[PDB]
């Protein structure tokens, strides 16, 4: 059984447990049971619950990035940002955020993994992509790409995260974020 | 006659905050606030009818002072915009403001009770005020915009503020003014102007 398949089983298991019983349910023993593997195997992928969180968050963003040369850079940008937003504003993503906002101990245990493997990754990836388009004169930027990435992503995603966390809106994809993505691109990175 | 209403209002909001900070929502009772503010029940009830109104007054006190101070015809609209956004950020990213956000994020009952007042009196009001100001600057050609002013206000406050809110909530960053948000404000405005 390939490692990638085992990793997928682990992430699915971790999410199922988080959703059914919160952090308390997402134990190493529980995940192994759910994933169909023994601890000796699980430990190759995760040493503890923080690592499970990192795997889970990574799974949401890893598939986003794998056109470095689109003809319509702005349209490509809209698609990338939309996909990032769908990944980090889903019910599962906002529930995890809410869990950490609500428990200092859980932040203490999981925040480094959560931060390292989430939006920060997407931000770095997007910065690289933006630099390429700027270089090709395809997408000129008035400030460094890393700043554009951060501000753009923040423009689109942050207020919605705030809203969903508070129940002012339901999680994506219940409402259409495409218009917001289009407006941000027009404003921040035309 | 009596001193202006602003005097007692200030006492109420101070009291509400102290109680929130000392004992949570449960400490911020109407009787508690009246006692901490040093006012009669009948006086408090002129200003707030319940805990939700107290939260609304509190949130309003953070944002109310921002716009009276704002020139309609600035010599440098981009510079003025930076100042406005910075001021909104200081008001809504303070330790007290983030604590309140965190409280609501953490308790569904508290959201059910307080969200409407919180929402109506906070960032939503600042967004509306900022949209109005941006529309004025666009109409006057000082700050042209490619999309409607309301959209720019929303996107700009999201970019500059709602993202740090996430960070502070999580403890990734300390509340303002522990770190300097001016560079972020400047970068965001440069993308506009």
Short mmCIF file of C-alpha atoms in Angstrom, two decimals, chain A:
data_model
loop_
_atom_site.label_atom_id
_atom_site.label_comp_id
_atom_site.label_asym_id
_atom_site.label_seq_id
_atom_site.Cartn_x
_atom_site.Cartn_y
_atom_site.Cartn_z
CA UNK A 1 0.00 0.00 0.00
CA UNK A 2 1.67 3.25 -1.16
CA UNK A 3 2.61 5.87 1.36
CA UNK A 4 0.39 8.44 -0.36
CA UNK A 5 -2.57 6.18 0.11
CA UNK A 6 -1.79 5.63 3.77
CA UNK A 7 -1.40 9.38 4.24
CA UNK A 8 -4.80 9.97 2.64
CA UNK A 9 -6.34 7.39 4.99
CA UNK A 10 -4.75 9.12 7.94
CA UNK A 11 -6.07 12.55 6.92
CA UNK A 12 -9.56 11.20 6.30
CA UNK A 13 -9.53 9.51 9.66
CA UNK A 14 -8.33 12.59 11.48
CA UNK A 15 -11.05 14.71 9.93
CA UNK A 16 -13.79 12.21 10.69
CA UNK A 17 -12.81 12.13 14.34
CA UNK A 18 -12.47 15.92 14.62
CA UNK A 19 -15.93 16.32 13.18
CA UNK A 20 -17.58 13.72 15.36
CA UNK A 21 -15.96 14.46 18.67
CA UNK A 22 -13.51 17.35 18.47
CA UNK A 23 -9.89 17.34 19.49
CA UNK A 24 -10.61 14.85 22.24
CA UNK A 25 -11.71 12.24 19.69
CA UNK A 26 -8.74 12.76 17.40
CA UNK A 27 -6.32 10.58 19.31
CA UNK A 28 -3.43 8.69 17.76
CA UNK A 29 -5.06 5.40 18.66
CA UNK A 30 -8.37 6.56 17.19
CA UNK A 31 -6.80 7.72 13.95
CA UNK A 32 -4.87 4.45 13.54
CA UNK A 33 -8.10 2.50 14.09
CA UNK A 34 -10.00 4.67 11.62
CA UNK A 35 -7.20 4.56 9.00
CA UNK A 36 -6.68 0.85 9.21
CA UNK A 37 -3.07 0.86 10.34
CA UNK A 38 -0.91 0.05 13.35
CA UNK A 39 0.90 2.65 15.42
CA UNK A 40 4.31 1.66 14.08
CA UNK A 41 3.03 2.76 10.70
CA UNK A 42 1.14 5.84 11.85
CA UNK A 43 4.28 7.10 13.57
CA UNK A 44 6.09 7.29 10.22
CA UNK A 45 3.60 10.02 9.23
CA UNK A 46 2.77 11.68 12.54
CA UNK A 47 4.33 11.62 15.99
CA UNK A 48 1.37 13.10 17.75
CA UNK A 49 -1.81 15.11 17.42
CA UNK A 50 -0.05 18.30 16.31
CA UNK A 51 1.41 16.44 13.38
CA UNK A 52 -2.07 15.11 12.54
CA UNK A 53 -3.33 18.70 12.39
CA UNK A 54 -0.42 19.63 10.08
CA UNK A 55 -1.22 16.70 7.78
CA UNK A 56 -4.88 17.66 7.68
CA UNK A 57 -4.28 21.32 6.93
CA UNK A 58 -1.61 20.43 4.38
CA UNK A 59 -4.12 18.17 2.60
CA UNK A 60 -6.39 21.11 2.00
CA UNK A 61 -3.73 23.23 0.31
CA UNK A 62 -1.27 20.78 -1.19
CA UNK A 63 -3.45 20.05 -4.23
CA UNK A 64 -3.96 23.68 -5.18
CA UNK A 65 -0.69 24.47 -6.90
CA UNK A 66 0.65 21.37 -8.71
CA UNK A 67 -0.16 27.36 -15.75
CA UNK A 68 3.16 29.03 -14.97
CA UNK A 69 2.51 30.73 -18.32
CA UNK A 70 -1.18 31.63 -18.68
CA UNK A 71 -2.28 33.97 -21.43
CA UNK A 72 -4.71 35.70 -19.09
CA UNK A 73 -2.80 36.02 -15.83
CA UNK A 74 -5.65 37.80 -14.07
CA UNK A 75 -8.14 35.08 -14.90
CA UNK A 76 -5.65 32.42 -13.70
CA UNK A 77 -5.15 34.42 -10.51
CA UNK A 78 -8.92 34.49 -9.89
CA UNK A 79 -9.03 30.73 -10.22
CA UNK A 80 -6.12 30.17 -7.81
CA UNK A 81 -7.51 32.53 -5.14
CA UNK A 82 -10.98 31.03 -5.45
CA UNK A 83 -9.56 27.55 -4.91
CA UNK A 84 -7.54 28.71 -1.87
CA UNK A 85 -10.64 30.33 -0.44
CA UNK A 86 -12.73 27.19 -0.92
CA UNK A 87 -10.01 25.29 0.92
CA UNK A 88 -9.70 27.54 3.97
CA UNK A 89 -13.37 28.67 4.33
CA UNK A 90 -15.01 25.23 4.26
CA UNK A 91 -16.97 24.03 7.24
CA UNK A 92 -14.07 21.83 8.31
CA UNK A 93 -11.52 24.60 7.96
CA UNK A 94 -13.56 27.15 9.89
CA UNK A 95 -14.44 24.62 12.56
CA UNK A 96 -10.71 23.99 13.14
CA UNK A 97 -10.07 27.72 13.34
CA UNK A 98 -12.89 28.11 15.83
CA UNK A 99 -11.56 25.21 17.91
CA UNK A 100 -8.17 26.92 18.24
CA UNK A 101 -9.68 30.38 18.88
CA UNK A 102 -11.64 28.82 21.74
CA UNK A 103 -8.97 26.87 23.64
CA UNK A 104 -5.61 28.22 24.70
CA UNK A 105 -4.29 24.72 25.46
CA UNK A 106 -5.22 23.53 21.98
CA UNK A 107 -3.47 26.58 20.52
CA UNK A 108 -0.50 25.82 22.69
CA UNK A 109 -0.39 22.26 21.38
CA UNK A 110 -1.44 22.74 17.73
CA UNK A 111 -0.84 26.27 16.55
CA UNK A 112 2.67 25.77 15.19
CA UNK A 113 1.55 22.84 12.96
CA UNK A 114 -1.62 24.62 11.92
CA UNK A 115 0.19 27.81 10.98
CA UNK A 116 3.12 26.16 9.23
CA UNK A 117 0.99 23.99 7.00
CA UNK A 118 -1.89 26.25 6.09
CA UNK A 119 -2.51 29.67 4.54
CA UNK A 120 1.18 30.49 5.07
CA UNK A 121 2.11 27.82 2.56
CA UNK A 122 -0.45 29.03 0.07
CA UNK A 123 0.79 32.55 0.59
CA UNK A 124 4.41 31.51 -0.23
CA UNK A 125 3.28 29.56 -3.28
CA UNK A 126 1.17 32.39 -4.55
CA UNK A 127 4.06 34.86 -4.03
CA UNK A 128 6.28 32.70 -6.27
CA UNK A 129 3.65 32.48 -8.95
CA UNK A 130 3.03 36.20 -8.84
CA UNK A 131 6.74 36.90 -9.25
CA UNK A 132 6.77 34.83 -12.40
CA UNK A 133 3.90 36.73 -13.97
CA UNK A 134 5.40 40.06 -13.02
CA UNK A 135 8.66 39.01 -14.61
CA UNK A 136 6.93 38.11 -17.82
CA UNK A 137 5.33 41.52 -17.80
CA UNK A 138 2.15 39.55 -17.52
CA UNK A 139 1.15 40.91 -14.11
CA UNK A 140 2.95 44.03 -12.97
CA UNK A 141 3.02 44.76 -9.24
CA UNK A 142 3.71 48.02 -7.39
CA UNK A 143 5.06 46.24 -4.30
CA UNK A 144 6.85 42.93 -3.67
CA UNK A 145 4.95 39.76 -4.62
CA UNK A 146 5.00 38.43 -1.06
CA UNK A 147 3.13 41.56 0.04
CA UNK A 148 0.66 41.32 -2.85
CA UNK A 149 0.02 37.62 -2.02
CA UNK A 150 -0.66 38.40 1.63
CA UNK A 151 -2.86 41.43 0.97
CA UNK A 152 -4.79 39.78 -1.87
CA UNK A 153 -5.47 36.61 0.04
CA UNK A 154 -6.35 38.68 3.13
CA UNK A 155 -8.71 40.91 1.12
CA UNK A 156 -10.63 37.92 -0.12
CA UNK A 157 -10.54 35.49 2.72
CA UNK A 158 -10.13 37.26 6.02
CA UNK A 159 -13.39 39.08 6.44
CA UNK A 160 -15.29 35.98 5.29
CA UNK A 161 -13.41 33.87 7.87
CA UNK A 162 -14.45 36.40 10.54
CA UNK A 163 -18.06 36.29 9.31
CA UNK A 164 -18.29 32.50 9.17
CA UNK A 165 -16.63 32.10 12.57
CA UNK A 166 -19.33 34.32 14.05
CA UNK A 167 -22.16 32.68 12.13
CA UNK A 168 -22.88 35.87 10.13
CA UNK A 169 -22.53 33.68 7.07
CA UNK A 170 -22.40 29.93 6.50
CA UNK A 171 -19.18 28.22 5.32
CA UNK A 172 -18.24 28.03 1.65
CA UNK A 173 -19.56 26.82 -0.67
CA UNK A 174 -22.99 27.97 0.61
CA UNK A 175 -22.47 31.46 -0.82
CA UNK A 176 -20.66 32.70 -3.92
CA UNK A 177 -17.15 34.10 -3.35
CA UNK A 178 -16.39 34.51 -7.03
CA UNK A 179 -17.50 38.15 -7.17
CA UNK A 180 -15.31 39.01 -4.19
CA UNK A 181 -12.35 37.27 -5.82
CA UNK A 182 -12.91 39.16 -9.08
CA UNK A 183 -13.19 42.50 -7.30
CA UNK A 184 -10.00 41.89 -5.27
CA UNK A 185 -8.01 40.96 -8.33
CA UNK A 186 -9.26 44.07 -10.18
CA UNK A 187 -8.26 46.25 -7.20
CA UNK A 188 -5.09 44.68 -5.89
CA UNK A 189 -3.50 42.95 -8.84
CA UNK A 190 -5.03 43.98 -12.15
#
